[PDB]
Every structure is written in C-alpha cells, then in structure tokens.
Design a protein around this nucleic acid. Structure first.
Lengths: 130, 220
RNA sequence: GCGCGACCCCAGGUCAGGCGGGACUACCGCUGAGUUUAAGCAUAUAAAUAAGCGGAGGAGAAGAAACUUACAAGGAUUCCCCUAGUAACGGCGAGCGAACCGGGAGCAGCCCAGCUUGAGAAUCGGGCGGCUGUGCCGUCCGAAUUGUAGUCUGGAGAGGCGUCCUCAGCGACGGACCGGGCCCAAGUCCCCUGGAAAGGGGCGCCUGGGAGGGUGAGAGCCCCGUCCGGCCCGGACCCUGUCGCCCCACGAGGCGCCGUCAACGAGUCGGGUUGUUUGGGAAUGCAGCCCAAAUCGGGCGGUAGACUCCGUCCAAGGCUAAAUACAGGCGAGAGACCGAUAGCGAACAAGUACCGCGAGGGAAAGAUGAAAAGGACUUUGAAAAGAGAGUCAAAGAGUGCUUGAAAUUGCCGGGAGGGAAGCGGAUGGGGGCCGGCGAUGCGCCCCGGCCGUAUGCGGAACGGCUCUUGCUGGUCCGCCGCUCG
RNA sequence: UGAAACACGGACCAAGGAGUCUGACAUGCGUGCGAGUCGACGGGUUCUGAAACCUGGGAUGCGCAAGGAAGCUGACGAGCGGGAGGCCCUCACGGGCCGCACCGCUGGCCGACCCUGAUCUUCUGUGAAGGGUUCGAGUUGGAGCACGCCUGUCGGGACCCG
RNA sequence: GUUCGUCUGACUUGGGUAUAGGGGCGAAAGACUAAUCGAACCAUCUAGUAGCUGGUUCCCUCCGAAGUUUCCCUCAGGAU
RNA sequence: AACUUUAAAUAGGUAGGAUGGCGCGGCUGCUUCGGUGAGCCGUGCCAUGGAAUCGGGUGCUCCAAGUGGGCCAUUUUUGGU
RNA sequence: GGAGGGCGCGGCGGCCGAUGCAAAACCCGGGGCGCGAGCCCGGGCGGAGCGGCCGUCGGUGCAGAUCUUGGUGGUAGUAGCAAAUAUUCAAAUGAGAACUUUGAAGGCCGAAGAGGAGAAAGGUUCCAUGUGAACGGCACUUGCACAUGGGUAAGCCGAUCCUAAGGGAAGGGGUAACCCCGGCAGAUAGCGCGAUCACGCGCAUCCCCGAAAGGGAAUCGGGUUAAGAUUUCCCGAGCCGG
RNA sequence: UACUAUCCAGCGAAACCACAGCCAAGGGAACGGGCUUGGCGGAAUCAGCGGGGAAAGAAGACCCUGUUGAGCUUGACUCUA
RNA sequence: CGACUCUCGGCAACGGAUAUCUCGGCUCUCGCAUCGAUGAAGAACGUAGCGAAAUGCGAUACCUGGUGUGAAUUGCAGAAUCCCGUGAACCAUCGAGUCUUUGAACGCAAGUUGCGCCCGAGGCCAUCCGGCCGAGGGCACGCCUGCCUGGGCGUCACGC
C-alpha cells in the first residue's frame, strides 16, 4: 500500500503481532493517554503505565470508576483495573477488562526506568515543536 | 499495473486415484485407494471432485500485459488536455466547482515551494477549487467486498489534480496528502491521471510553466 | 647379517588435523523409460524428459581461443532481444530443428609445465621456546634433487645496451554495508440515540502523518502505529574518504632500441569401426575397441576425396567476479487471490486422530458475549433435566452457543369429504386470505388576510451585440415619493 | 428414425460442479498511425512491481521470382464493356460528357522456362531487337503494421468425466 | 448341521530359517504368493489415451438445417 | 430387361435482341494465287422493342457452425413367397 | 445451429445513496411491475456493515451427470433381535431388580471340558473404590465401560552365555552408485599363554548375531495380597560361580 | 414334537424408490399402472402370498463393434540375451 | 361422523446452508547465506505444583548464565524480596552453558537398556608400594603426514 521500503506493512501482520504481544510490543501498546494536568508537565500525550498508578475510566459505560491497575494480560491484550467490574450470578465480583486507550492516567509512580521514558519522549516533543 | 496471479500449478495433481471401473452402482470416476478415513473426495483427477483440481481455473499463463501503441496513446493524452477547456465534461464527470472567471486554470509558479497542507487548502479555497476536495474528505466510501480485508478500506473520490512544470520532477509535498488529490509533473503525465476510469475531463490545475510544455506529448 | 643417511615395503586405541549423512527449492554431473503422438505401429515422437544415483555453494557451471570468420575483419565466459518458428533433419509422414553474425545487459584479467639457484633447497611441514598471532621469529629434527623456490606462459618471454619512472608496511578517525534499541502532530469540548459513540448534530485542532490495526458500532485527532526527521548502540570491513609516520631505489620491474633464441603439454592428434546422441547431413558431440603422429610443426575452414593456394588460431594443464538461476530454508513486501464442502492435506493439537503387515494412505473439526456477567437461590425429580428466579442491550445469545435456509417432523387452522379412481396442471366459478379506493374538484361573488405595479428614486447579475467604442433593449431587488389595483 | 415407453438415469433437498486460460494463427469488427509501423531487450527516471521519457533499431511491410547460381535487371506506359455519382443540354422523357467503387475481358512489362541475338567486347562475354498452347503468392498506378475483442484453428490436461 | 475321506506315514503341526514380481513356488489347479493373481500390492510417470456412453449450468428476439457428393485400414469417425 | 424398323405421355435442352443489329472505315505475322475473308478496335443510326408472367427488390464476395447413422407415405420400381 | 438485444451474481476503477433512532442476511396460501431473465415494496426475524448506476474483469447463474460432499424421508416401528439342553423361587440393596449380589432349587460343560495355566498377541484390560452421560444391538443400581487409585521386586526361572540352518561387517572385485558375492599378503602384519621381567613360545579359515522351543552354571518348602509365586515375602535348609 | 413365524414389552436396521399403484381390449419404440374406449371404483386395515411391478442385486459374463487391451502359440513383422 | 389421505400458514424441532466475520491459506515479488563425527537431519522417552495435547526443554529437564526491557504470571494456588531494583516476566535478547536415550553413529553386536576392553581418583589394608572397590570418559571404518619394531639376494657396502 502506502510507500517506503520497510519491514512492517501487511494487514494480517499488524493484527498478528499485537494480539500475542512480545514484551516490547506489550509496553508500547500499554501506552495510555495522560490526563490534561500531566500532559503539561511531561509534555507528551500518552505514556506506558504501571501497577501502582491510578487510572480513571473516561470512555465507556463504566465511566466514573477509578482504581489502581491490578494486572495486565498479555495473551489477549487487555489490562485489568480495580472497581471496573461485573457481578457474577452468585454475588461474586469479577473485573471487566478495559483497553489502555479507553482509560486515562490519573496518577503516576515515577520509578527510575519508567522515569527515563518520560525524559526521552519529552525531548522528542521539544525538538519538533521548537 | 497488475501482477500475474494464479491458482497453484501443482495443485491437487499429486492425489492418488484409481477406479473401480464398473460392477458397481457407482459412477466411472477414479476413487481414493484409502478406505479407512472419515471422508476425502473420492479420487481427484476430476473437474468434478471436492478438493480436486479443475483443468482450467487460472494457472500462470494469463497475460497481465497488453501492449500499447505510442501513436495511439499520443492521441489519448492530447485529447485529455482539451477536456479541461470544455466545462461540460468536467461537470459530467461529477466535479463540484464554483471556480474562477476563466475556463482551465493557470496558476502562479510559486505553489511549488509550499510546505504546508494548511497553506495548500487555503490557496485552493481562493480559486474555488477546494470545493471538490471538500467533497472527497467526506463521502469517502468503505468499499464492499473482500477489498476490506486487503488494505482497500477506503476508496477516495478524485478531485483536483495539480501538475507542476518544474523541470527536475519536483513533487509539491504539501499537495501530496490532500484528500482526493493526485500530484503530477508534465514529465510524467499519463492518461489515467487526467481520466481515472477512462472518463476524461478531470479538473486539473496547470502551472504557467507547465502550460507550454503540454504540446510536446508523445472529422476534427 | 648388522646395510649410519637411505633404498623398498609394512604397523601404531599413533602426533596435529581431515571424510561419510543431510539439504537436494534452485544448480552441476551421471543414467534413463513408457504412456502419448503418428487417428494403427516398429523408424521417429514424447525426451537426450520423468523415475534411479552422486556432489557443492549462495549462487553454481562457464571462462581469456588449437574461436568466429572471409571482413578498412570481429574477439574469454553468461544471460536477454533477434536470427526462428527458420537453414537443417524426417515411414520428407506425424513431426522434428539450432547456431554464426547484428543489437543490448554486464565487464577483468591471469600462472604453471616445457631454456640456468648450481656461490652451494635460497623452499616447506612438524616439535620446541617466545610473540602483539587465519600469522611472525629463533632453535632442532624431518620433507624434497625420480626436483622444492623460480624468471617466463604465447598477447609472449629470456639476453645485451641506454635512460627515466614506479614499489614493501603501518596507526587513528569517518563513510560504505548489516542488525537492533529509542524518540519524533493534534479534541477524549457540549447535545442526542444506544448496553457502550468511534455514530448523527453543534463547535475545534493537527497534518513530511486523512495507510492500517487495536479499542464495547463508519476513530486523522482514544492508544499503538503511520509520515518525516533526530539520537544511541553493536557488528562486519579493505569497498574509499580523510589525515599522519616510515619512502619501499640506486634493487627489482616497466618503457625505448638492439641480438641470439623462442623451449609452446601423446595412445593425445587424427583415423577406422561400432553404439549413443545431435538440425548437422560420405559421421554433431560423445565413448569403447583397433591403428597411430609431428614440432620451419599442428589444428580449424557446416558435402566425402587428391591437388594448389589463401585465411585463421595455437589444444591435448590450471584459477578467476559481474551480468544468470531460484516451487527449499530464514527474514520481508504485495495481489481486481480464497472465504470454512472454498483455500494447502491441515485457519482448530495436522502430516495429528485413524486406516493398512508394509510400501504408503490420511480426515472430520473456526464464530456465546462488550465482559462470563458460564444461570446462586427456591421448587419438582432417583438423577439427567424441567419450572420459577437471578444476569444480560439482547437468552428469539445458556459452551447443541452470531445469523440459524431447503428436506423432514410436530401442533393447529382453513378448504374438502368418509358414494368413490389418481400425472398432481391449465382453463372457469365459488369459499378462504389480504391490499387497494385525488389530498375531495371548478367558476363566481362578500368579509377577513397579505402584497403591490406604472412612473420618479437608489444599488446591481443580463441581452443583442458591437467587441477602441458605440447605440438600442433589462429585469430585479432595496424600498421612499405619486396615482391606482 | 421414433422415448410414455416392457430403452437408460434420477428417493428428496442444500452446497460444490463442466467451451477456460495461454502461445502462435485466419476472418470479422474497432482503435491508432500510415510507406511506414511496432515505447517498455535496454537506458534515463520514479510519487515506485506502475506511470513518464527515450535510443538505435531489430521484427514485419514497402517488389518480385527461382531448386540454385541469379536475373537487359521489374519506370515508356494501357485499352474495352457494364458502372454509382456528377457535369452538360432538354419543360420533362431522354440524349450527350466525365466515369468511381466493383466486376469481366484483352494486352504490354518482370522473374523462372523457351526461342530471338544488332552495334559492341579482357576472347565469350553483350542483350539493342522481335516473340511463345509454359509458369509465378509479381509491375501495369502498393497497404500495412501495432493493439484489442468475439468466433474459428493448432499445441497444451484443453468442454467436463471415464 | 447331518452324512462322510484320512488317521504311523509320500503323516500331522509350531517356531526359527530360505526363495519376491515376467519374479517366486507348484505331487501342475494357471493354482497360489496377507479378503488381492492368465502376471500381486503401493507411489510415481499420470491431470496418460479412448472416432465411443453419461452430463454440460440465465432469458427473449430474428433467421434456420442435414443425414447427401467425393476420398479414406473407410462404412460408430474425419477431410471435401 | 439384356430384340426392334417403328414408337408415345409426363420429364429434358436451346432461343424469343440495346450483354442486340445495322452503316461508316482501320489493322494482321492470319486467311485469301487476289483486301479476298475472318476477328478485334474508333465513329454514327435504331426503345420500350421485340411471347406470357412475376420479382412486399436483386445481384455479388468473404468467412464460420451444424450435418456427415436418417426414417416414412402416395406414385414409379429391382431382389424376395 | 448462428447471429442479435438483455437479465442476475462476485470483485476492481469511477460516481451517488443507505445505516444500531436498526445494515446485510433469512422468512412471508402479503401487495405491485416486466413477455421473460428478474425487479420492486410492505410485515416478521435480525444485529454491522451494504446496495444502485457508469466502466472493467471472472474460479459467474444448475435438475440431473449409475454425479461429489453434507442433511433428511417413505421403507418401518416393518424384517428382525430364533444355534450353543434352562431356568425359577425367596432375601439383601436401591427411586426402580426375570438379568446385580447372597441362599435355596433346577441344570449345563462331562475332564481331547465351558477346566487350572503358559506361549503368541493385546497392554493395564487384573483389583479396590467411585459409578450410569455415552457403551454392554433387552434391561440394569452390575461391567472386561467411564472416573480415581494401586499392583509385576529373582546369584539359582527365562532372556543373558552358546552354536544350527542361515544371516552379515571385514578383503579382493564388479557395479558411477545404491548394492551383491564374501574374506583376503590378521599366512616371516596378531590374536592367545607363560610372564612381570622383558622376553619367549603356540595358532587361522576369522568374528558376531541366529531357537526368548534346540543345547544349557546352580532352589526348595511354607506363608501372603488384588494376582502368577521354585518366581513376591519369610523361615529353615542348600547349591553354583568368583 | 422342538425352534420360529404370529402376538406382546424393550430394542431396531437394510435393500430399494421418476411419480405411483384395479382390470379388458386397442393402437403405439410393433407385449400399458397411466393414453384411448369400455367395465369399474372401501374409508381405515392385518395375517398371508409368490401372477405382476418386462420388481431388486450385477454398464449382459455370451454375441457384434472399437483402427481397445492383455494371457497364450508360431512357419507373423522386427530385434535380442 | 370423528379419523385417515393431502395441502398451507403461524410458532417450533430437525439440520448447518446463507449472510457478515478471519492471528489462516494461496500466489507473486524482494532481501539474505548460513548444517554435520567439534556428534547432524530424524527418532525415542522423560521433565511443568496441579498436564492429556501442542509448544518448550534435557538429570543444569515448559529452563540456566549474561544482556535488554522495567513489573508482572494468572485457571487456582504461591513467593513476598524480586518492586526508587545487578531486577518481575509461558518475556525478548540469549555471546557463556548443560544438552538425556538414540540416530551418519564409531569397542563389537543388536528382536539384547547385550557382551567386552582400557584409563582416571577417593578410601581401605599391606598375603608385598600390591590386592580390592568407587564415580567419570574413552577404545571404529577410511587415509595423509610425521613415528617404531622389522619382513624381503628390493639394492649396496661391510661381515666371519
């Protein structure tokens, strides 16, 4: 289709890679849009999340829930957040999977290696803009 | 502009089939040797078998190259220029135009050195030639069929064509990504650019330096 | 006997190292059918193909003329275009059947043997020590005169004389090539419908990016990517670009001129005969056997032979990229490909399950949903199940799961009738079933309602045309004046 | 020949399922250009399997006829009858004039074949000249080439199946 | 099933072992050689061929045949 | 029937004109002992006009399919009860 | 049989439309159009993408083919489920018992057994416990089924060791080669014994596999669990080889 | 006389099927369940049965043909270990 | 006169067609060179806490070192130091590894977990400084090169 001698371009291949996600693939697809306050600090629109973050449902029917990211699932690429749930018949509460795109990052744990991601991407956005 | 494609050339050829002949209320077709399987088409030098070959259905032969005669082609290319100087064909092809005081457009040479798309749409807006590109940034068709599963999710209608007359084959970068656009130089004009679908009289934008080079293309 | 060296020939679970098999797509050899075609069939065709067998590499084979030619000669090898669907060959039947030249692609040239190290095996392997190590150095055994090192290779070359010119080998740093990592634009603003908004509507932004996928419905702007650039990192590496240090010279080779020479590969040449193969035809290549040479010579010159000429190369040793191939393998990009009886045998645990003693043969089989929210609990029943309920946007979605066709089956209704004969239909009438059927038309007058022309004004798109320029004809709207409708 | 047939197949239904595609050919039809024509082996170039541009060509045709060598070497150049249509005359009917397409026919010319053989001439060449129940895919006032489609034709598994 | 041939030898029968496809083996039936024998089975060449049988897929329009001549290893078919 | 002098009918061929006739005057190696003749050329004259009837037109050329097993009746007829 | 003019499907370039406020699909003794090919529209079902028109192109339209593959009838609840001498009663259990299990009874094979075991073969089937979804063409609470567990112990038995018919490396030689005969200069090429001491002496048709049946180094008894027990276990007694 | 059939409870196929099923004669692919003309004309059925359905199984094994094979024979053609 | 025979509809059951999907096939094109006695191609049998399979691996056994990424793996259980970190992960990379039993398959055979031979060290006790036992790994064909004992008037000299 559209241009360039490169490795990647194939409608089938794009699907194949992202569903079964190897570790580097997981982290880049774990990039979830920042809230507006955070966007003006780190000068980026989206960053990969964590487990000690807190993340707010904006998009869905489930909107208005907030919780920490309990788990992230490779095999079918989904993330699981606390308090976005559906109830089983007996009264058990089981988490409903949410895509990281849908959910928006309330709060960050900086870390040290995750912190490095913020710096490099920020530098990136500085270069184009000015 | 089409690849050759085909059915497999060794297909279901290498399938063992040997016949019962007759003495059975079973048709005189070859038949699988292996009875001890829950199915498989019963012998397969056929055109008449499940999972067998068919003697025809493609196989690499089919010419996806038809030769063009240059003198024949020259007439077609020349005709295409003339189709922009009659407004009737432009209307007939289904271009929405609120355009200028004169019939084909000739433009200043300074829209080569235009980096931005934002600037590009603005200059077209003044002409009134932005009109049909606005009708191709929406009303863009999710095409039915198996094309969706290829890469052909959107087939975009064909609005303005811009042709530059800068000698060194200079693609105007801004105009490349406009909705429904095509970009050309005089040094690479073809019939399909001025007449997608074979319907002549696409709305085209001529550069001033382009205009006087259109002569040298290669009752009444 | 014992023969120092050695001669000739054996032996180490011997010292350091090496071979088999695979792959076999594609390639290089070997070896080799028949069906078929000729409407029969043998010669011939298929085919110098399939099968059989061996062996390498990323390419392989080929390769600097014992060539092609007959010319003001071309000029290693390969492939494409053409010659060519042709010269030729052929129960001259069916059919079979290429090259030379010409053009283009790509280009690249070489060393041994055969003249002398003879002031001396100057050469090489191994052990051993040291070393900065695909190597180098010292030392000692051993190899090899039935000849290592070597000038020199036919285009030539070795001698001689005279002049210039030209060199061996290093750092360091880029680029070249390959692989990664990493970064690189913009709304999740209001409203509506919905289970969800990516949808519609309102209102925006970014675009070297409006390819794609993901995401709870058509997402440029939600995420990932995409695009275009940036920043790292590690390889591989003599392809060249920098620089910098030794100038490798009086050597060796090159060039100019001169002389004496010119060594130029054998059971090969060539021929006969036979078989195979060739378009190759008094033998195309090939082989066996038989005969068998020469070096002022030899071979070739598409009809066998002698004769005389002329022309053309220099075998019988060897290397060498590129242009050429690619149904395997690995890693990619695509298609007017296919859409679960299709596509591969295999979308799924598939060469799986299974079949056969074996060689081998070989399936069937994708889809709940956004999320299991996979039906707790109550009740009947021995249980399986059912009935309630719960859940879901939807159970008319309950792991027979999206949609759920035909056939068949059940229920029920209608027609018909239990005094009657069947091609199942056509034709006619009745029942049974159901959709349709100007918005309700016109003239006139009265009231209510609304507007106003002509002409003057004020602003304009028009016309015939002329086309500098000119004259005749505009209508309309704004909306004031003056008269009416 | 004749199918209701005491011919043959078919319980029923769904889904598969058979004149295709190609190379080289003939005709027809269309398109281009036209005594030429045919880009694309190739090279330039690129928004990249494309498109655009361009080369000498080579292939086919523009002359032929022979088995071959070859051919004074194929340029002197044609009539007649029916002919559409036009022209001229005539009020018209018709008459006369020019006559295409096309058709039929009679000649000349060329090659192959056979005769004829001047003047000339490197000594056997030469080919003026006059002819012929011979023969040709010729000249006598060319038409092709390229592309495509249908149908026919051949090789291909070749309509499908045995 | 009944009836019945043989039953101390050219006897019966197992295991191990030999012989394999124009081949074997045969006190010989063309018998038999793993439900397979006047040339086993398997895969391949092979999608082999067959003037002959079967089937050959949407509609309407207009025109509309012939089984005859000639040659043929031709008389179930071609050329003409 | 394989005889016929003789000899039907129905069948079958040809002709009934402008693709014709006639006048004028040209050429030949033919043909004539002879321009005598023959043929073919230029030029002139003669229409409904050469029996009947019809031509909801005809003439002409290229190319291809199918057919290539036929069968039947009246009439004629050969073999055979 | 030809030509002519159309229709329908799939996909592609163009162009225009339609949609979760309900697309496509499917159903419809519901309407209407066209000579037809087909088309149109409504209602019901349904839940995510699709159709018309102009060009382009095909793996493009079915009733068959003793068609292929899948489904489903009538047949038909019909033929049948009939060989093997044969069941029956009471109790136990369980929802339910002609068939299970126990007793009682009747029988049957009639020791060349319908027997107790081993071979071969299968491979856990043996036994417990659980237990009726499928399966035991009846039934069923039972099973050689399904699920869940466990179980096979050797100096003396076999294999092993050993030779046979025979097979097959090694050699020479054909065969490119696969492959086949089969040994040769293991014959003044080394294997074997003394022998510890390094040296001497002696010799072939080699060398392995080949009968879990031939031939054979060596065990008995009692007890035990689900079972064969010389065999597992154990006592006591041996026996063979080093 | 046994064991079936039959009848029951359970269990439960297949072959086969264009569509089906009353005769007579007629013509007709020259021997009809159907057409034509007459006769007829039990719902719903079971146990039987062997006339018929030119019933079914089996592209007649025979017989003819094909420019179709193969086994065999030889004084075929042509080669050869 | 129920019924039967037939037919249809509506709702269903049957069945898995149709539509719409597709981490797959299919075909074309491009780049790339790179197996082995240094033990392959291929097989076998094991190893995951709970596994039949596929996939992964080999007694160092669904993996190890090192490295990158930087917190998951998930059906349930679990570790909590491994979470501001020499470090989570059916992770990617995977340079350093193990890499079973087999297989060209190599001591020799193989319907045999068959039958030899040799060497290593640790311990023992001296019927000896030897005897006995241990765990590991070798010992093939083929042929070159170098090597030793020599066969042989093979050839020479020198023998008594």
């Amino acid at each position: 289709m559209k241009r360039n001698p490169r490795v990647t371009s194939s409608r089938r291949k794009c699907r194949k890679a992202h569903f079964t996600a190897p570790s580097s693939v997981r982290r880049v697809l774990m990039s979830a849009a920042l809230s507006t306050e955070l966007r003006h600090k780190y000068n980026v629109r989206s960053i990969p999340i964590r487990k000690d973050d807190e993340v707010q449902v904006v998009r869905g029917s489930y909107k208005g829930r907030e919780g920490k990211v309990v788990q992230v699932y490779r095999r079918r690429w989904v993330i699981h957040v606390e308090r976005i749930t559906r109830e089983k018949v007996n009264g058990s509460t089981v988490n409903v999977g949410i895509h990281p795109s849908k959910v928006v990052v309330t709060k960050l744990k900086l870390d040290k290696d995750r912190k490095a991601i913020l710096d490099r991407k920020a530098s990136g956005r500085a270069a184009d803009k000015a | 502009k089409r690849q050759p494609y085909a059915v497999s050339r060794r297909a279901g050829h290498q399938t063992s089939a040997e016949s019962w002949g007759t003495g059975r209320a079973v048709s005189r077709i070859p038949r699988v040797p292996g009875g001890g399987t829950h199915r498989a088409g019963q012998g397969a030098f056929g055109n008449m078998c499940r999972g067998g070959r068919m003697f025809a259905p493609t196989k690499t032969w089919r010419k996806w190259h038809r030769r063009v005669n240059v003198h024949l082609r020259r007439v077609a290319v020349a005709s295409a220029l003339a189709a922009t100087s009659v407004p009737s064909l432009v209307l007939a092809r289904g271009h929405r135009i609120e355009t200028v005081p004169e019939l084909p457009l000739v433009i200043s040479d300074s829209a080569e050195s235009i980096e931005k798309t934002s600037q590009a749409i603005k200059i077209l807006k003044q002409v009134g030639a932005y009109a049909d590109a606005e009708k191709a940034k929406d009303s863009v068709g999710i095409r039915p069929g198996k094309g969706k599963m290829r890469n052909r999710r959107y087939i975009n209608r064909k609005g303005p064509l811009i042709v530059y007359g800068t000698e060194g084959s200079k693609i105007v970068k801004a105009f490349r990504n406009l909705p429904g656009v095509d970009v050309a130089n005089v040094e690479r004009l073809n019939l399909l650019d001025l007449a997608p679908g074979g319907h002549l009289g696409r709305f085209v934008i001529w550069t001033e330096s382009a205009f006087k080079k259109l002569e040298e293309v290669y009752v009444q």
